[PDB]
Design a protein around this ligand. Structure first.
Ligand SMILES: CNc1nc(C)c(-c2nc(Nc3cccc(N4CCCNCC4)c3)ncc2C#N)s1
Lengths: 299, 257
């Protein structure tokens, strides 16, 4: 019942619907409410809502935002989530001066990988990992949020929706129009986010699909049949692509040390088959001294 | 590849939590196995007409049986349940789900758009929004990876057989999706190549030929009688070159089990 919730303030807008911070008047719990209007919907309940709800009810993990309840009032659908204090994007902006302490970056990446590994182990692709969809609390946790673009996949995969992942974090195999994409696309996104936590600027801020590709090519080198077998046969590959040399990773993210650069390069492998899985990444030497410190800033 | 084992294990767990009640049809006062068989056969047609995934068909049927497992329905409302289920399945599984108006259209104007949307909400409430159910199809595609080498006729024939099981609540409500997929894969493999349930699937699934035998015995009979079954939409569908015309193959007279 909505009667037990007192609204506090509007937070923003999700991939679909509007989000409010609210307070359970009886338990005191602070929640986030996602309102989906069913009136104005001549198509019934939106597929994005149907997927987000069904998939999220299955995904109970400390690094995945918890769906607490689903409330059907008159012509409205309310999703009740646990409340988190901030998203990663705004936290990185707030850290413009001091930068983000390595232990926190390490901890955040480790947690994101755990959360993602759980998703993939439960046949769910997120398909929209970006700082704005990663939420942090005051105790040092970070969690995957907004499963509006997610979907349950099969083994092996089928062709799914092509228009997925926010451009900046979109994997090359999607950009090149591969008939099949899988768990690797989410890993690519996390790699981009890893680099962004270190520099506090986006790794590949493209303005279009071709700009996005070329930005990727100029950093990691233009892929050939050796580094990525089958690449020249991909639907949107063109022989006219400029052929850029691959540059040292020490230059892609200069502050990163040996271990970090190692992990990043495996997360950004061109060949989705060679790209590291979230599960395998958990055991990378980069995390040997990982802890879970609180954010160095007041949220 | 890295999560194939994790995922199989998870589906094995979920398929149990998502099983309809095996004996629900007896408790439905005004509907029968036959009426259900007519409904599913029609959904097969809807699937073909709109070029929907087989997964979508399998999901819709799971939604229907779960719905009927806890809700009494008069015969005149059965198709409405089926229509809403197919709409939900489409939304969940399809890249381009047909629009509501098209689902209203295929019911030959038996129901209104308002009825279809209200039922969709009721189905969601009854299933408590738990739509990500394991299907015979999902297990089949996993099993297909154990071919040496891969054979299209085997794969298409397995899907054909798995789909046949959707039509007849008796006896197929009593078997799990992973088990029906097992029988289907073996029966198709044996029919086309003479090979059997490979040892690598025994390791993966824990099922042996003996374990699969009861379901296999049933499926084999359904296969032999398919040309005489009252519902034919599936055979017609699998006449198509898209599925390598596998429904034109002769079932084996014996299985030697
Ligand atoms: C991006 N879509 C989202 N949907 C929900 C329900 C979100 C959510 N948000 C919070 N709290 C919170 C605190 C500070 C900022 C924000 N943002 C909204 C505006 C910009 N987009 C990024 C996040 C949200 N707590 C829990 C959830 C959940 N689930 S975020």
């Amino acid at each position: 019942s909505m009667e037990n919730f007192q609204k506090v303030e509007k937070i923003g807008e999700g991939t679909y619907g509007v989000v409010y911070k609210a307070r359970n008047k009886l338990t005191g719990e602070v929640v986030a409410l996602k309102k989906i209007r069913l009136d104005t919907e001549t198509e019934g309940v939106p597929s994005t809502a149907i997927r987000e709800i069904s998939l999220l009810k299955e995904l109970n993990h400390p690094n995945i935002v918890k769906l607490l309840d689903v409330i059907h009032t008159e012509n409205k659908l309310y999703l009740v989530f646990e409340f988190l204090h901030q998203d990663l994007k705004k936290f990185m902006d707030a850290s413009a001066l001091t930068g983000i302490p390595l232990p926190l970056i390490k901890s955040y990446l480790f947690q994101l990988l755990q959360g993602l590994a759980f998703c993939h182990s439960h046949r769910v692709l997120h398909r929209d990992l970006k700082p704005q969809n990663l939420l942090i609390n005051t105790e040092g946790a970070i969690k995957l949020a907004d499963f509006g673009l997610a979907r349950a996949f099969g083994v092996p995969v089928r062709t799914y929706t092509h228009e997925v992942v926010t451009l900046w974090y979109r994997a090359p195999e999607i950009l090149l129009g591969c008939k099949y994409y899988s768990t690797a696309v989410d890993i690519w996104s996390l790699g981009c986010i890893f680099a962004e936590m270190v520099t506090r600027r986006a790794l590949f801020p493209g303005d279009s699909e071709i700009d996005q590709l070329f930005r990727i090519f100029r950093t990691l080198g233009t892929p050939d049949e050796v580094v990525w077998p089958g690449v020249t046969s991909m639907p949107d590959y063109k022989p006219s692509f400029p052929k850029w040399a691959r540059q040292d990773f020490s230059k892609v993210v200069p502050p990163l040390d040996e271990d970090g650069r190692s992990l990043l390069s495996q997360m950004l492998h061109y060949d989705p088959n060679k790209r590291i899985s979230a599960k395998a990444a958990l055991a990378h030497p980069f995390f040997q001294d990982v802890t879970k410190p609180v954010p160095h800033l007041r949220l | 590849p890295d999560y194939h084992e994790d995922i199989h294990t998870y589906l094995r767990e979920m398929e149990v939590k998502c099983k309809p009640k095996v004996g629900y049809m007896k408790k439905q006062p005004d509907i029968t196995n036959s009426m259900r068989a007519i409904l599913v056969d029609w959904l097969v047609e809807v699937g073909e007409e709109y070029k929907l995934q087989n997964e979508t068909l399998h999901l819709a049927v799971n939604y229907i049986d779960r719905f009927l497992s806890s809700m009494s329905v008069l015969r005149g409302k059965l198709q409405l349940v089926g229509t809403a289920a197919m709409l939900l399945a489409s939304k969940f599984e399809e890249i381009y789900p047909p629009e509501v108006a098209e689902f209203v259209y295929i019911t030959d104007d038996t129901y209104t758009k308002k009825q279809v949307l209200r039922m969709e909400h009721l189905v969601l409430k009854v299933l408590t929004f738990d739509l990500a159910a394991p299907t015979v199809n999902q297990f089949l595609t996993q099993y297909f990876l154990h071919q040496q080498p891969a054979n299209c006729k085997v794969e298409s024939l397995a899907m054909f057989l798995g789909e046949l099981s959707l039509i007849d609540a008796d006896p197929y409500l009593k078997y799990l999706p992973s088990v029906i997929a097992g029988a289907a894969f073996h029966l198709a493999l044996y029919t086309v190549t003479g090979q059997s349930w490979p040892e690598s699937l025994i390791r993966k699934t824990g099922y042996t030929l003996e374990s699969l035998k009861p379901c296999l015995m049933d499926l084999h009979q359904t296969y032999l009688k398919a040309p005489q079954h009252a519902q034919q939409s599936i055979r017609e569908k699998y006449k198509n070159s898209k599925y390598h015309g596998v429904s034109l193959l002769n079932p084996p007279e014996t299985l030697n089990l």
